[PDB]
Design a protein around this nucleic acid. Structure first.
Ligand SMILES: Nc1nc2c(ncn2[C@@H]2O[C@H](COP(=O)(O)OP(=O)(O)OP(=O)(O)O)[C@@H](O)[C@H]2O)c(=O)[nH]1
Ligand SMILES: Nc1nc2c(ncn2[C@@H]2O[C@H](COP(=O)(O)OP(=O)(O)OP(=O)(O)O)[C@@H](O)[C@H]2O)c(=O)[nH]1
Ligand SMILES: [Mg+2]
Ligand SMILES: [Mg+2]
Lengths: 171, 171
DNA sequence: CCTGT
DNA sequence: CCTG
């Protein structure tokens, strides 16, 4: 298996293009309340998880919930693309404020896999150019993650590696 | 600082070209008996740390010492280039034999930096082609380290990052 | 340096 | 999708 060690008090930041399987992954490995999703927050503020015009409010809400959880010492997983440094920056800062270990889990999957999954989705889709861009941003992000403040950086390089992941939570 | 978390029982594998500063780094961060060096082993078997013809015997000795230490539950740092997969393979296997966690620390420095340092050494030098080769092998190695069995993979991307390292030995 | 042979 |  692919064992990923994380401390009991972690902020797990999922990094991946739309279609890379972040939400599917989060549901398999974590409790529902441990996972806070940017799309869910778009729904919380606007009724519409697909409404990009409420992104600002959605991430304000996400960051707020993350802060409340870390204040209470609860492990939290951020289910958003997190492919822009500007998106990861405030998450690292919140983790620092509450002495929480930031962990990066990167879905380094081929653009074509994400595009294929997106084409076959029935829940929500994005345009092809979005996935092309997210994949490029994800790839450019990998080198600098440790320096950004991620204490553990785990890169998953194929669907096979994603499937094999087992988290080892250390108390 | 660049905080690198490692378990009390770790096999820390330094990965870097000649001239990348492995031995300097090892002395700064670890007690002498925690560090086992391939060049020191060349000296043990032949009187000459620079004798490349005794490489087989030197690594036999290094592996034997690593095995004894991990068996005794002692943190161990391997100071060798470790830029070939075939070199890392037995280290991972010995770690697994004794339920020890392998940690990779990669000196991902520009070839030019290593060459300049090499040029100014008075203790021992290698030819430029050696460093060019080591650097290429190091860079080609990075992606696959987690899959090889390294439970923690830390990549240092500049002399500034190397200098900033602080190990956090979790009990 | 896990060896330009 | 932190909005080409
Ligand atoms: N075959 C296969 N399909 C998967 C896997 N993971 C996710 N999928 C499918 O890919 C599609 C996208 O998966 P999601 O988990 O929603 O992807 P996401 O990264 O959360 O995408 P966004 O929310 O748009 O950012 C879904 O229809 C899944 O059923 C996988 O591991 N294997
Ligand atoms: N400026 C600077 N010089 C360094 C640093 N680390 C090592 N050096 C110099 O670079 C040269 C090589 O350093 P070593 O620690 O011996 O490098 P190594 O990786 O062990 O090299 P090999 O034993 O040949 O594989 C030495 O002369 C060091 O003094 C550093 O962090 N900063
Ligand atoms: Mg999702
Ligand atoms: Mg050395």
């Amino acid at each position: 298996s692919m064992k990923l060690t994380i401390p009991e008090l972690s902020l797990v930041v999922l990094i991946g293009s739309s279609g890379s399987g972040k939400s599917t992954f989060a549901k398999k490995h974590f409790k529902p309340t441990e996972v806070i999703s940017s799309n869910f927050c778009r729904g919380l503020v606007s009724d519409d998880e697909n409404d990009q015009t409420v992104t600002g409010a959605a991430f304000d809400v996400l960051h707020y919930i993350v802060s409340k959880r870390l204040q209470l010492g609860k492990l939290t997983v951020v289910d958003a693309t997190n492919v822009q440094e500007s998106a990861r920056k405030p998450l690292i800062e919140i983790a620092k404020d509450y002495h929480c270990f930031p962990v990066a889990v990167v879905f380094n999957l081929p653009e074509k896999v994400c595009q294929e999954r997106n084409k076959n989705r029935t829940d929500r889709q994005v345009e092809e150019y979005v996935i092309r861009k997210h994949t490029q941003q994800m790839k450019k992000s990998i080198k600098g993650l440790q320096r950004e403040g991620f204490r553990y950086v785990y890169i998953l390089n194929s669907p096979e590696e994603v499937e094999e992941v087992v988290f080892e939570r250390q108390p």
